[PDB]
RNA sequence: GCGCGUGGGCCCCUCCUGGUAAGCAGGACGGGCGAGGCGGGACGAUCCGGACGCCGGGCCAGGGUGCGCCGCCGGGGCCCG
């Protein structure tokens, strides 16, 4: 690069969707943000005032701060060997909120859920924790139509 | 033929020893490593590695400090591994056992004219090895005016102070000047 | 003039390490140096090139020291220093030095007979009668 | 308290005698249930597919000169530091796909019964405080798994061939297993084109009986 | 006369070889760049009752 | 070198809780290599990748080879310039035994290795049938040739450490 | 915490820019030489294997096995490397 400004690189980045462009759901505005929450930061073109830089796109974060018109994030940028917590300020437009946290926060309330019976009706308690895939098992599969294959002579 | 660096975070040293000419340290530190290893306490634990620790690792406590840790804890011992210095500022010092490696000759009148006892690390050994009714009390060890300059006076988040007089304003007048 | 019996003394090299290029130059005197040159054949240990000393041609410690008639040697002096020798030393022997005078030397060596101390160089000097 | 010591023998020796008894009988009727039950499918014109594999013996296959980042990471959480190391792996979706990033410098398959304890007992060695401490008795397994239920040798043998409950504990006490030169063809191609890298099965077995 | 003007070989080795070091703990904490407001209102609010320390 | 009928199918799914099994009759040096031929296949022929689907069962085909049999093999393989289609024919006593003989002439003359020939099919053909006389000058019911090669007694002379008296006759 | 050396790099793999091209110039991920012994690639800094205390026995990688020069045969096909 020879030109490093403020938007350099950011000709698909910050541009619109295909049918996406015009003014923000109201929606935007309206859903209410929490200390703590985690937020995905995806800039929206159209709005040009607190808006996060390129390398901010695309990286989730914590709120810092909710303060008026716009809200403090705390991501972590690896800069060279040291990864670095950032606090940035966006306004509404260009944050969203994240689903990160949903599958831990589904799987607790499960996990109690399962806990609770355990504790009265079935008090054996099943395994509560996440299994990758596992090797398959046995089972008897009838062949019964079994459809022969063969390589196919090559044509062109 | 051996990969062991993928996941090994290299050898850390620590002082084993006290590097101390001083026969009587030498001579605690393995008194009380022998207990350690023969009876396998924290106290004499924390103990043993304190005496090998050097001078600036080991910071005095005041007899104002002492009073004011052991106010709840008369009772229990206060072991100190430096030198107790009196506060002439605490007009009244409060009566307790204390044992250190040096009591300085105010702290030593003083303590006794209260009616408590300056006990050595030879009595702790002998008297409360293992430590019962013990407390291991440390000095402030930032108190160095040495570790209060470390850092990178200068740069925006320092909050250090610059080494020597500078007189100037660039830089030093403001996060603007310079 | 018998040892204890000791374990069989093995020893890694027989040879004494000679300096790289110590032949080619009466100049570099035989004592090893570290090869220590930036395109040194014998640093880089290429094929064919002399053997560098490390600690791995270190001999048993247990038999370390030990002269070939499995005895350790202590350089005596005088016949005081015989006392050194006479505080059960039965595993070391005796050397006497070479400054020592035939004179002084026919003393320490009766002292050793009564002790049974052995002395490696016990026909040093001896030439005849004085 | 001295005594006692001859007590665990008894208690550790019983499960011992019991156990391989025991299991060898299991073993043997793991073979006719699965040729019955095949038998079985035959006259319902069905096939009886086997239970996919539960544990694979992994043999590093090449050395650590430039290995890339990515490779000598997966390679040290497969305690796979040294060329001719085997250690046995547990198949998971987890493993079986890092196993695939590193097949270039391993081979893999399914141990037997008897390749499991021929390299339990002739190359055994067990981590104790961080040091290879060697398996010559049982009483060294049941000073630290019986907590993980395996007071013997056979004991582990069960937990290390059927994938059990103690699998972690067990697999990692014993200590990365030190296996002599392997024979290998080619080392580059793949058990598929010929050489030797990557998943060999069955084939696992012979290629470690050299190496024992 | 010319040199190279750029290379990143080994700079991500360099990186790595003790890196990848996480920021601390307080930072993650701190009160900079929060709230003016919100943080007066914290120092009034635990001025009172169990939390305050004020004596 | 050794006939394997390896069956497979589609892991189970929502949409098709059964799914069709494919069987291949594949010729390989081993089980592993035989499955993944059969992988090689179903992921062109049926679009299904190994990952996606599972082996029912691998299972060894073995012949009794104690007659002389036709058996014609039709390939595809891939040259220089691109794929081409040719058909074989090795008489042999199994069909496994043939399948290496066929292999054997398709490295030699046509440089072509066992992943670049695919196998269209193997079918014995009997004598009437055969379309290549280097075949078919065997299946007449008298075959009277003097030995091929009798100077290859020359085994015998690498013992001796070739110093024989007289030079041996043929 | 204290501090040293360094800040001419160059090769391989793959991905590239300028150029007719270059053992050319300029970049990227990883590796290597630098600073890596050793066996092989006839020879070589970097290739292919292997990364090194001193030894004895055993195995065997890569690369080979007429003779220089350690180590080979058996089978199928082709044939003025």
Redesign the interface.
Same mark, same amino acid.
């Given at each position: 690069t020879h030109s490093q400004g403020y938007r350099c690189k950011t000709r698909y980045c910050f541009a619109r969707k295909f049918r996406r462009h015009g003014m923000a759901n109201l929606t935007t505005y309206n859903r209410v943000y929490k200390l703590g929450q985690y937020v995905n930061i995806k800039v929206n073109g159209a709005y040009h005032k607190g808006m996060p830089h390129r390398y901010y796109n695309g990286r989730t974060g914590t709120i810092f701060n909710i303060g008026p018109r716009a809200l403090g994030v705390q991501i972590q940028k690896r800069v060279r060997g040291r990864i670095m917590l950032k606090r940035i300020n966006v306004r509404l437009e260009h944050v969203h909120p994240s689903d990160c946290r949903k599958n831990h926060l589904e799987r607790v309330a499960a996990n109690d859920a399962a806990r609770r019976l355990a504790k009265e009706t079935g008090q054996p308690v099943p395994c509560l924790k996440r299994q990758n895939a596992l090797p398959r098992a046995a089972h008897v599969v009838s062949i019964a139509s079994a459809i022969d294959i063969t390589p196919l002579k090559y044509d062109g | 033929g051996i990969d062991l660096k993928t996941g090994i975070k290299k050898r850390k040293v620590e002082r084993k020893e006290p590097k101390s000419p001083n026969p009587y340290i030498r001579l605690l530190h393995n008194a009380f490593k022998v207990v350690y290893e023969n009876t396998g306490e924290d106290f004499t634990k924390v103990l043993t590695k304190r005496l090998c620790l050097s001078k600036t690792n080991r910071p005095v406590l005041s007899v104002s400090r002492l009073a004011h840790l052991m106010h709840k804890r008369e009772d229990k011992i206060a072991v100190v591994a430096s030198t107790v210095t009196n506060d002439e500022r605490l007009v009244t010092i409060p009566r307790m056992t204390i044992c250190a490696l040096k009591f300085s000759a105010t702290a030593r009148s003083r303590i006794e004219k209260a009616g408590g006892r300056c006990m050595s690390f030879d009595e702790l050994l002998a008297e409360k090895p293992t430590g019962d009714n013990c407390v291991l009390l440390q000095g402030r060890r930032s108190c160095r005016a040495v570790c209060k300059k470390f850092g990178s006076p200068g740069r925006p988040n320092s909050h250090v102070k610059p080494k020597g007089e500078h007189k100037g304003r660039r830089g030093a007048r403001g996060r603007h000047s310079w | 003039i018998h040892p204890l019996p000791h374990k069989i003394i093995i020893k890694k090299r027989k040879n004494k390490f000679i300096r790289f290029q110590s032949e080619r130059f009466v100049r570099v005197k035989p004592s090893w140096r570290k090869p220590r040159g930036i395109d040194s054949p014998m640093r880089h240990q290429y094929r064919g090139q002399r053997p560098m000393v490390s600690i791995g041609y270190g001999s048993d410690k247990e038999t370390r020291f030990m002269l070939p008639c499995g005895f350790f040697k202590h350089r005596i002096s005088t016949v005081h220093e015989l006392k050194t020798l006479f505080m059960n030393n039965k595993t070391h022997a005796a050397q006497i030095a070479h400054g020592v005078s035939a004179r002084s030397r026919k003393q320490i060596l009766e002292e050793a007979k009564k002790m049974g101390v052995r002395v490696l160089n016990a026909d040093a000097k001896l030439r005849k009668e004085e | 308290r001295a005594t006692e010591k001859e007590k665990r023998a008894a208690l550790v020796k019983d499960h011992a005698v019991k156990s391989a008894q025991v299991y060898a009988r299991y073993y043997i009727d793991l073979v006719e249930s699965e040729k019955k039950?095949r038998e079985?499918?035959l006259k319902?014109?069905?096939? +009886?597919?086997?239970?996919?594999?539960?544990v694979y013996l992994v043999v590093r296959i090449r050395?650590?000169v430039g290995?890339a980042?990515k490779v $000598?990471?997966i !390679?040290? !959480?497969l305690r796979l $530091?040294?060329?001719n190391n085997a250690v046995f792996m547990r198949?998971?979706?987890?493993?079986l796909n890092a196993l695939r990033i590193v097949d270039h410098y391993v081979t893999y398959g399914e141990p037997t019964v008897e390749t499991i304890r021929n390299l339990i007992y002739k190359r055994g060695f067990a981590k104790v405080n961080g040091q290879r401490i060697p398996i010559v008795d049982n009483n060294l397994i049941d000073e630290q798994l019986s907590k993980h239920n395996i007071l013997c040798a056979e004991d582990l043998v069960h937990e290390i061939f059927t994938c059990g409950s103690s699998f972690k504990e067990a697999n990692n006490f014993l200590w990365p297993f030190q296996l002599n030169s392997a024979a290998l063809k080619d080392k580059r191609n793949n058990?598929?084109?010929?050489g030797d890298f990557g +998943?060999?099965?069955?084939?696992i077995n012979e290629f470690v009986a050299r190496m024992i | 006369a010319k040199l190279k003007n750029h290379t990143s070989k080994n700079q991500n080795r360099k990186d790595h070889r003790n890196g990848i070091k996480k920021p601390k703990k307080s930072a993650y904490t701190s009160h900079k760049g929060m709230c003016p407001k919100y943080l007066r209102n914290l120092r009034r609010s635990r001025a009172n009752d169990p939390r305050q320390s004020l004596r | 070198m050794q006939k394997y009928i390896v069956y497979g199918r589609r892991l189970p799914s929502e949409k098709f809780p059964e799914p069709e099994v494919f069987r291949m009759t594949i010729y390989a040096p081993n089980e592993i290599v035989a499955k993944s031929r059969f992988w090689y296949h179903l992921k062109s022929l049926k679009k299904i990748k190994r990952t996606h689907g599972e082996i029912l069962d691998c299972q060894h085909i073995e012949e009794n080879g104690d007659f002389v049999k036709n058996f014609g093999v039709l390939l595809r393989y891939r040259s220089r310039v691109g794929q081409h289609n040719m058909y074989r024919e090795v008489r042999e006593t199994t069909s496994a035994r043939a399948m290496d003989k066929v292999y054997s002439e398709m490295a030699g003359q046509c440089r072509a290795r066992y992943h670049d020939i695919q196998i269209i099919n193997v079918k014995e053909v009997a004598d009437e049938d055969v379309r290549r006389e280097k075949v078919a000058m065997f299946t007449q019911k008298g075959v009277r040739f003097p030995h091929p090669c009798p100077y290859v007694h020359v085994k015998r002379a690498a013992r001796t450490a070739r110093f024989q008296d007289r030079a041996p006759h043929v």
């Amino acid at each position: 690069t020879h030109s490093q400004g403020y938007r350099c690189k950011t000709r698909y980045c910050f541009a619109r969707k295909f049918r996406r462009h015009g003014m923000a759901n109201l929606t935007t505005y309206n859903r209410v943000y929490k200390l703590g929450q985690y937020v995905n930061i995806k800039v929206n073109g159209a709005y040009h005032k607190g808006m996060p830089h390129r390398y901010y796109n695309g990286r989730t974060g914590t709120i810092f701060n909710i303060g008026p018109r716009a809200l403090g994030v705390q991501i972590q940028k690896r800069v060279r060997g040291r990864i670095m917590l950032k606090r940035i300020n966006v306004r509404l437009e260009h944050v969203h909120p994240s689903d990160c946290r949903k599958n831990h926060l589904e799987r607790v309330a499960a996990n109690d859920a399962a806990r609770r019976l355990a504790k009265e009706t079935g008090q054996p308690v099943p395994c509560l924790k996440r299994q990758n895939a596992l090797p398959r098992a046995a089972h008897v599969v009838s062949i019964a139509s079994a459809i022969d294959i063969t390589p196919l002579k090559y044509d062109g | 033929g051996i990969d062991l660096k993928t996941g090994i975070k290299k050898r850390k040293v620590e002082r084993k020893e006290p590097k101390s000419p001083n026969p009587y340290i030498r001579l605690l530190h393995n008194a009380f490593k022998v207990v350690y290893e023969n009876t396998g306490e924290d106290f004499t634990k924390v103990l043993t590695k304190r005496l090998c620790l050097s001078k600036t690792n080991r910071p005095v406590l005041s007899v104002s400090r002492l009073a004011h840790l052991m106010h709840k804890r008369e009772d229990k011992i206060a072991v100190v591994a430096s030198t107790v210095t009196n506060d002439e500022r605490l007009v009244t010092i409060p009566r307790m056992t204390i044992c250190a490696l040096k009591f300085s000759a105010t702290a030593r009148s003083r303590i006794e004219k209260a009616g408590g006892r300056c006990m050595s690390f030879d009595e702790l050994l002998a008297e409360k090895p293992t430590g019962d009714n013990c407390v291991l009390l440390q000095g402030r060890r930032s108190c160095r005016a040495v570790c209060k300059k470390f850092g990178s006076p200068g740069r925006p988040n320092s909050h250090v102070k610059p080494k020597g007089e500078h007189k100037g304003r660039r830089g030093a007048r403001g996060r603007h000047s310079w | 003039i018998h040892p204890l019996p000791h374990k069989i003394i093995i020893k890694k090299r027989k040879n004494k390490f000679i300096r790289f290029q110590s032949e080619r130059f009466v100049r570099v005197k035989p004592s090893w140096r570290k090869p220590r040159g930036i395109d040194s054949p014998m640093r880089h240990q290429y094929r064919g090139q002399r053997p560098m000393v490390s600690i791995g041609y270190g001999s048993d410690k247990e038999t370390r020291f030990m002269l070939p008639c499995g005895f350790f040697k202590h350089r005596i002096s005088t016949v005081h220093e015989l006392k050194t020798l006479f505080m059960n030393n039965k595993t070391h022997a005796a050397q006497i030095a070479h400054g020592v005078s035939a004179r002084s030397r026919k003393q320490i060596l009766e002292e050793a007979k009564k002790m049974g101390v052995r002395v490696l160089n016990a026909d040093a000097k001896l030439r005849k009668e004085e | 308290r001295a005594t006692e010591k001859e007590k665990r023998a008894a208690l550790v020796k019983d499960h011992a005698v019991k156990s391989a008894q025991v299991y060898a009988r299991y073993y043997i009727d793991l073979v006719e249930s699965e040729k019955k039950a095949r038998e079985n499918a035959l006259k319902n014109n069905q096939l +009886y597919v086997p239970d996919e594999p539960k544990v694979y013996l992994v043999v590093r296959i090449r050395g650590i000169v430039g290995v890339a980042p990515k490779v $000598r990471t997966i !390679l040290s !959480l497969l305690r796979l $530091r040294q060329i001719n190391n085997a250690v046995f792996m547990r198949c998971n979706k987890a493993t079986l796909n890092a196993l695939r990033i590193v097949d270039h410098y391993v081979t893999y398959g399914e141990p037997t019964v008897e390749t499991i304890r021929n390299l339990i007992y002739k190359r055994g060695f067990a981590k104790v405080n961080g040091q290879r401490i060697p398996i010559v008795d049982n009483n060294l397994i049941d000073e630290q798994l019986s907590k993980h239920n395996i007071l013997c040798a056979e004991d582990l043998v069960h937990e290390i061939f059927t994938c059990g409950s103690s699998f972690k504990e067990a697999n990692n006490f014993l200590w990365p297993f030190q296996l002599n030169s392997a024979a290998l063809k080619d080392k580059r191609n793949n058990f598929a084109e010929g050489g030797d890298f990557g +998943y060999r099965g069955k084939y696992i077995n012979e290629f470690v009986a050299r190496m024992i | 006369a010319k040199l190279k003007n750029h290379t990143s070989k080994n700079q991500n080795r360099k990186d790595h070889r003790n890196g990848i070091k996480k920021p601390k703990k307080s930072a993650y904490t701190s009160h900079k760049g929060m709230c003016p407001k919100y943080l007066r209102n914290l120092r009034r609010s635990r001025a009172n009752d169990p939390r305050q320390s004020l004596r | 070198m050794q006939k394997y009928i390896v069956y497979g199918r589609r892991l189970p799914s929502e949409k098709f809780p059964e799914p069709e099994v494919f069987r291949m009759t594949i010729y390989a040096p081993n089980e592993i290599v035989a499955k993944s031929r059969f992988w090689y296949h179903l992921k062109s022929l049926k679009k299904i990748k190994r990952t996606h689907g599972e082996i029912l069962d691998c299972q060894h085909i073995e012949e009794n080879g104690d007659f002389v049999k036709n058996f014609g093999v039709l390939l595809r393989y891939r040259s220089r310039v691109g794929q081409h289609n040719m058909y074989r024919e090795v008489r042999e006593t199994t069909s496994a035994r043939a399948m290496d003989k066929v292999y054997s002439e398709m490295a030699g003359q046509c440089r072509a290795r066992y992943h670049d020939i695919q196998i269209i099919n193997v079918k014995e053909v009997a004598d009437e049938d055969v379309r290549r006389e280097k075949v078919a000058m065997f299946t007449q019911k008298g075959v009277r040739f003097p030995h091929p090669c009798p100077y290859v007694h020359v085994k015998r002379a690498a013992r001796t450490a070739r110093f024989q008296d007289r030079a041996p006759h043929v």
